[PDB]
Amino acid sequence: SGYGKDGNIGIKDEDGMNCGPIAGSCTFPTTGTSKSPSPFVDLGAKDAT
Amino acid sequence: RLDELRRIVSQLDIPVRQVMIEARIVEANVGYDKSLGVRWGGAYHKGNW
Numbered sequence A: 001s002g003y004g005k006d007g008n009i010g011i012k013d014e015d016g017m018n019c020g021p022i023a024g025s026c027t028f029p030t031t032g033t034s035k036s037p038s039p040f041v042d043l044g045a046k047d048a049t
Numbered sequence B: 001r002l003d004e005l006r007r008i009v010s011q012l013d014i015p016v017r018q019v020m021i022e023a024r025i026v027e028a029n030v031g032y033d034k035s036l037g038v039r040w041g042g043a044y045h046k047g048n049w
Helices: A009-019 A038-046 B002-012
Strands: A022-024 A032-034
Touching: A009 A038
Parallel strands: none
Antiparallel strands: A022 A032
């Protein structure tokens, strides 16, 4: 997370999950995600500053 | 004594001098204020200032 203008994408990635993307990670080597609607909205509002 | 007091009486019975005092107040206030808010927002690639 940032501090001058605090930002941590992971929390708002949970908010993105609230939007509804498919995220799967069974081990640290293995992960994959699909159906992500979080970036454009979460970042656009989040990064408005 | 009568006459001397009479002379003083004549001098003393003098009208007190009234003066009309006219004081003028002049106030001039000039205010110029300009503010610019410039916004470059795009949610397509998440670039918004």
